[PDB]
Each structure stands twice: as structure tokens, then as C-alpha cells.
Amino acid sequence: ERVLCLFDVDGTLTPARQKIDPEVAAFLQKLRSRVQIGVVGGSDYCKIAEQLGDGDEVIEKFDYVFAENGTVQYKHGRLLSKQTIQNHLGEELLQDLINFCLSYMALLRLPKKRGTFIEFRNGMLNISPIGRSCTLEERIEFSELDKKEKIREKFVEALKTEFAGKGLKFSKGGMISFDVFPEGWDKRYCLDSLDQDSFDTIHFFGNETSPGGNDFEIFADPRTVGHSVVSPQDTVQRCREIFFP
């Protein structure tokens, strides 16, 4: 009777990294007459906020806004505090990680390099072996280089081996970067808080629910009814079938 629908963002509600279609948006508000609705994305809040309305409207349009996998949470218009990756990991392991990344990147000799190789967020370190500080022509340029030299991939292989058994996970962040987060700080993190809000059912929709994907763990988790979608139209489709039959 208390139902929440929880959506991944990229590919599930919106074209990847882009604004939502006003028609999907319009539907989500309709869905809201029956159930509460929320989103969970890997990206920071501002990025998510941008894709889903104007300014900070997203927190008004959605009952739940879980950014950075849920390490950052908005609930019914208001911010709830965030745990810090350093509080969770502690300083020593976090610095072993950081120094390893610095020492590995120092040895990479590329065509170009830019800035902000290691960005410290709430629920992850975002690592970019070229530089988060590049333009569009440069994003595409490194994107090509990464494919050819497997830069991120080899870096991740080396990181996983070095920190084997120490509770870190790595997943790519699309172009030029990868994330490093504590084990358990994938999308499932948001479920722990949601456990306290007395939902009878939590429907999750995601487009990467296959093994490997960033939606897998939350989709497979026994706390959710899992749904696999291919597009924003597939998502609306499914919600119609279940909630408006």
C-alpha cells in the first residue's frame, strides 16, 4: 500500500547525461498520484539536478533524490546528511589508494595531460588519467586514446590487484574517468536508508541490470522488485503496465 518506484537516471529516465523528455517527466508526475517516486544516480547532485528539471526543482518533483549512489540523499524536499568515504575507509587505506594512483599516473606518458586527476567526492574518488579539466574536442580525443591504449582498464586491473581483499570497488565513469568506492557503495547504499521509511514494496528500474552493470546489485537485492528497461519509453511502458493496467 505504501509503494516507492526508484529509477536509475542515465538510460532509464533520460537519454544519457541529458535532459529528460517532458513527456517522460509528465508521466512520472502522473505515476506519483499512485506511488512515491525517486531517482538514484552515480553522478553528483548538480549533474542529476540539471538533467531532471530547472535548478533544484528535482527535489520537488521527486520524493527521493539519491546522488552518488545514495551517499547523498534528498528526501521530500530536504537534504539528509552524508557519510564520508574517509570516515568509512579511514585515512591510512585512503592514502595508500591515493598515493598508488598518483604514482601510477606519474608514470603514464601520454600525448597530453590536464588537471584534477583525483577528485574527492562524498561516496567515491573519481580518477581521471587525462584530466577532468578538458574541453569537448579533448574529451573525444582522450576517449579515443583510452580505447586504444586501455588506459583506465589497465589502471583498474593494477588497482584491484594491489588492493585485493581490502574492500574497494571500481567501475568506469563513461569517458576519461573511473570511480573508486567502498564495497557496498554501489546503488544498494540507498536501500539502507529506504529500509527506515516503511515501504511495503520498492520497485527498481534500471537499464544496466545485467551482471557487470551499475544497476545490477540494487536490481538483484531482495529488498527490491527488480525491473529491466532499455529506454525511457520502456520505463514508462512498464510503469503503465504495473500501475495503470
For residue 84, with 0-12 CB atoms within 10 Å meaning exposed, 13-18 middle and 19 or more buried, which class applies?
Answer: middle
Does 221 belong to an annotated binding site?
Answer: yes
Which entry of Mg ion, a copy of itself, none binds 10, CB below 5 to 8 A by partner kind? Mg ion
User: Per CB under 8 A, which region of 105-113, 152-160, 184-192, 211-219 contacts a copy of itself?
Assistant: 105-113
Can residue 226 be called a binding residue for Mg ion (CB under 5 A)? yes
Distance of alpha carbon 75 from alpha carbon 73, whole angstroms: 6
Q: Which of residues 118-137 bind a copy of itself (CB under 8 A)?
A: 118-121, 125, 131, 133
Which entry of Mg ion, a copy of itself, none binds 151, CB below 5 to 8 A by partner kind? none
Distances in whole angstroms, Cα of residue 114 to Cα of each of 12, 22, 109, 137 = 32, 37, 12, 13
Distance of alpha carbon 190 from alpha carbon 188, whole angstroms: 5
Which entry of Mg ion, a copy of itself, none binds 129, CB below 5 to 8 A by partner kind? none
Tell me the Ramachandran region of residue 69: left when phi exceeds 0, alpha when psi lies from -120 to 50, beta otherwise.
left
Can residue 114 be called a binding residue for a copy of itself (CB under 8 A)? yes
In the annotation, is 234 catalytic? no
Which phi and psi (to 5°) does residue 85 adopt? -55, -40
Can residue 11 be called a binding residue for Mg ion (CB under 5 A)? yes
Can residue 113 be called a binding residue for a copy of itself (CB under 8 A)? yes
Instruction: Indicate which single residue of 99, 143, 201, 210 sits in contact with a copy of itself (rule: CB under 8 A).
Output: 99
Can residue 55 be called a binding residue for a copy of itself (CB under 8 A)? no
CB nearer to Mg ion: give 8 or 146.
Answer: 8
Can residue 217 be called a binding residue for Mg ion (CB under 5 A)? no
CB nearer to a copy of itself: give 9 or 67.
Answer: 67
CB 39, CB 69: distance < 8 Å:
no
Q: How far is the CB of 178 from Mg ion (least distance, A)?
A: 17
CB nearer to a copy of itself: give 125 or 168.
Answer: 125
In the annotation, is 63 catalytic? no
| Active-site residue list | 8, 10
The footprint of a copy of itself (CB under 8 A) covers: 86, 91, 94-95, 98-100, 102-103, 105-121, 125, 131, 133
